[PDB]
Design a protein around this ligand. Structure first.
Ligand SMILES: NC(=O)c1ccc[n+]([C@@H]2O[C@H](COP(=O)([O-])OP(=O)(O)OC[C@H]3O[C@@H](n4cnc5c(N)ncnc54)[C@H](OP(=O)(O)O)[C@@H]3O)[C@@H](O)[C@H]2O)c1
Ligand SMILES: NC(=O)c1ccc[n+]([C@@H]2O[C@H](COP(=O)([O-])OP(=O)(O)OC[C@H]3O[C@@H](n4cnc5c(N)ncnc54)[C@H](OP(=O)(O)O)[C@@H]3O)[C@@H](O)[C@H]2O)c1
Lengths: 495, 498
């Protein structure tokens, strides 16, 4: 295989590694992937094009893949098409070779071209990888298994992912684009400070250089806090490393930001959010769903410790649910009837959005200063604001205190669901969830867990499908809130 | 001067162009300037260091600059030292030549080196600039005038600034660094969007490639909203271009972020803040001090159309001052005595910081949901949070509605002052102000004004000095709050909408 190196693969691959089914693409057409491939395989570096505007890229197929592309526009526009086979003679306007070894040498010695791309057949992928002729793989990752009979071979441990696109979705699949690859001083000087700054002790996925997956926002914050956070002790309790002031954003029209670097407990997230929506302050309602994230905060021991000796177990006081639905009402206990008492911020914001989406006062505030002394924990996600433009709903949330290990992944998914529900009930499209972190911290007993997590390569985000028949926010149940195509690394226990 | 070009200058220059006084530097030691010069003139690119591990840069001095240097400090370590002189013939560890052109030609022919730098003095700087021999100037900008007898030449209009550092400060000056210069496809593909995208229509300071001055955060947001904001109707009747969700941050230990690309009305900012702190909602208090920023919001027409027909003119309702000092009290009018009524959020947060810097309640909230029906205009900077780490105070503020042209420059300065005050009264150093913008918009009648603004090169930020005797936040007066070394471009008229 002398002179046959530096071959570049383009391929789209289902979760079970299937690439073909009965000589056809196993999934419905993804126009975005057609365009991606077209763009990747037609690019000529300007300085090459400027000395001969004729120069073109080579695109190589196995026989069956050629016969699989519609017999109409088979010669792919603006590219040299090459097909390989030990049986077929010659193809209309396409170079035909017996084997790959000979194909590459003939093109590289005789035919003026820029770059060679390997575009399909498991047979052709196999030879290329098995011998080491590929330096680069552009791979479209699909988060769903499909029936098929043709598969992409395993990628040798000699490759690593160096690039991940943002996550995208169609009505039927979520997906992204990745690149696998084998294996200026003024910018430093003009910080005005130390030119030889020690490398941060922690870096998320240090092999990935083009980092466009939205999950890197969260992983980078994890690495930042471990690297630079100040230790905040607490007597009676677990210490944490802390750093202040971050902003993340998630495009909710593209995908649903359920973290993939660990298996996140979606069911608990949804049940907690439905409980907020109903205005509940009764921790038993969550326990009945075997959701235990609020349990420790409702216990006899914890309540007494905080002065609420007269308060029934799992009566959490005037927390989120109460503020969302009854801001300003006098809190009694979790059993009281608050109908028509206080301000229903959630109802009012939905009505306001419908009535005047340009209102600059679309806010729900859970920071009820007068009520703080009746909660054992002050609200954490304490203020959010909606915004409408081009008929798309966005949301910005202020998180006072951010448990990065356990809490923040819940908040990201929770507010994303809430934004989608509100958009649906108000007849709006989806914009962005913008997440402001104030005190962002990592508990010291989570250090090892998050060190493990930041090394893991994000999978494409899943996508959210709400039941389209739900007209009112109070009508959503867990069965109406469906996350599709969630692919995650294993769960990481955190106390 | 054949073969004598591409000489790089390092210099530190006062606001009046002074660089020397009685053959010494006119100002005392500037910490980051010393490191900048040392780092800038010793650096060898790793690849160049591969092909010659012993390679060094050259630094060149004229005779008077040479004599200003303690003989024991020469040669400057890790660099080839060249002195230009007809009167000194030999300097241990240094090369001596009679003039510049002889030096550069002999260096480039016979003395292997990486880059040549010119370190002064004025005579050499003038020879270099007059003869077109310099392609790059690393210049330290000091934001105040110094007495002196020695000057840096005017920089030819063939140069432009291509890089600006963050602002730094000592006890005596604020300063920054600038560079003047004479004049991959996968990254595009892997966005997953159009590979060929038209350039944004608006770009702040397009000649500046390294953009580390904190003011660029604000200028970039103006340019982003002008480029991509949606035209959006609002309460005022003057439409604005609007985009959602930004975060800026300012290191308050280094400088005070009073914008330099227009002259900002600092006196108005200070008077407004003192008014918040005293808990006042009486707009006449500000008008009596010739501060008119709240005027339109207090007028009869405004109050009536928001249904406050029984409200006295310039009674601004239960806004910031009231919420900061009296949260939950019953608002009557601007004349009532609210002493010991409602929750004094400002006093409590200061006490909490002193008692426990890690308190879970370090918030001042001006969004009193129960009070919304009593307000003609609800608080825009409606929520802020303090945070302590390493005995330094930081602040994060949520701004629901951001008039980018007129309002945001005030907010930036106002919260930075407030953070400095709280830090002083709690015995803390300074961290960062983090400013979160929700609906950020440019009124249509400010578009031309901000277009003018974003083409202006920022000056180093000034610095803030509070009267250290003040121990209680209520005791600050305007005379206690002093901004030093403020250099700005001219003011830019912008009309207020209400
Ligand atoms: N999702 C994707 O990214 C993607 C991309 C491309 C293709 N596909 C799918 O994959 C399937 C087709 O792939 P396939 O593996 O069945 O067939 P293939 O590799 O396209 O072609 C097989 C035939 O081509 C010839 N050939 C292939 N590799 C050769 C080599 N290395 N050396 C010499 N000859 C070689 C052989 O010739 P003879 O038998 O003629 O002697 C062989 O029978 C289709 O279902 C297609 O839709 C999917
Ligand atoms: N703020 C800053 O960054 C900075 C930087 C540099 C200097 N400075 C200050 O500026 C002052 C020194 O500058 P300066 O203008 O007074 O003097 P200078 O340029 O340092 O030195 C003047 C002397 O240098 C010699 N010289 C320079 N170019 C020559 C050439 N082409 N051929 C022959 N001789 C040449 C002459 O030598 P002979 O007369 O011996 O023949 C002349 O008397 C000091 O106060 C210093 O602290 C400040």
């Amino acid at each position: 295989y002398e002179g046959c190196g530096d071959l570049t693969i383009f391929v789209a691959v289902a979760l079970n590694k299937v690439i073909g089914h009965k000589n056809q693409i196993p999934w419905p057409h993804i126009t975005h992937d057609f365009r991606f491939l077209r763009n990747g395989t037609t690019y000529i570096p300007p300085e090459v094009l400027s000395k001969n505007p004729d120069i073109q890229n080579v695109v190589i197929f196995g026989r069956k893949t050629y016969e699989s592309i519609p017999k109409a526009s088979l010669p792919l526009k603006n590219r040299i098409n090459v097909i390989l086979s030990r049986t077929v003679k010659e193809v209309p306007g396409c170079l035909v070779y017996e084997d790959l070894s000979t194909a590459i040498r003939d093109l590289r010695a005789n035919v003026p071209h820029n770059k060679i791309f390997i575009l399909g057949g498991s047979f052709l992928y196999k030879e290329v990888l098995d011998n080491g002729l590929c330096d680069k793989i552009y791979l479209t990752r699909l988060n769903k298994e499909y029936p098929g009979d043709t598969y992409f071979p395993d990628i040798p441990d000699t490759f690593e992912i160096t690039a991940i696109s943002p996550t995208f979705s169609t009505d039927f699949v979520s997906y992204d684009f990745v690149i696998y690859e084998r294996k200026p001083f003024d910018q430093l000087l003009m910080t005005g400070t130390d030119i030889s700054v020690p490398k941060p002790k922690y870096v998320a996925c240090p092999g990935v250089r083009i980092r466009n997956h939205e999950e890197f926002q969260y992983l980078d914050i994890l690495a930042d806090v471990l690297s630079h956070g100040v230790l905040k002790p607490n007597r009676t309790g677990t210490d944490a490393y802390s750093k202040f002031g971050y902003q993340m954003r998630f495009d909710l029209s593209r995908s649903f930001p359920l973290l993939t670097t660990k298996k996140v407990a979606l069911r608990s997230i949804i049940e907690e959010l439905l409980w907020f929506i109903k205005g509940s302050t009764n921790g038993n309602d969550l326990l009945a769903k075997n959701v235990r994230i609020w349990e420790l905060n409702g216990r006899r021991d914890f309540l007494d410790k905080n002065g609420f000796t007269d308060r029934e177990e799992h009566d959490l006081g005037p927390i989120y649910g109460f503020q969302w639905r009854h801001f300003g009402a006098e809190y009694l206990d979790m059993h009281a009837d608050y109908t028509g008492k206080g301000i229903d911020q959630l109802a009012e914001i939905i009505n306001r959005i419908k009535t005047n989406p340009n209102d600059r006062r679309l806010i729900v505030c859970s920071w009820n200063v007068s009520d703080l002394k009746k909660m054992a924990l002050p609200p954490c996600h304490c203020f959010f604001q909606f915004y409408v433009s081009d008929n798309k709903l966005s949301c910005m949330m202020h998180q006072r205190s951010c448990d990065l290990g356990l809490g923040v992944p819940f908040n990201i998914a929770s507010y994303s669901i809430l934004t989608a529900m509100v958009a649906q009930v108000c007849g709006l499209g989806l914009g962005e969830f913008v997440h402001n972190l104030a005190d962002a911290h990592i508990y010291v007993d989570h250090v090892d867990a998050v060190t493990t997590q930041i090394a893991r390569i994000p999978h494409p985000f899943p996508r959210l499908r709400l039941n389209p028949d739900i007209r009112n926010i109070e009508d959503f149940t867990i069965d109406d809130i469906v996350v599709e195509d969630y692919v995650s690394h294993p769960p990481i226990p955190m106390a």
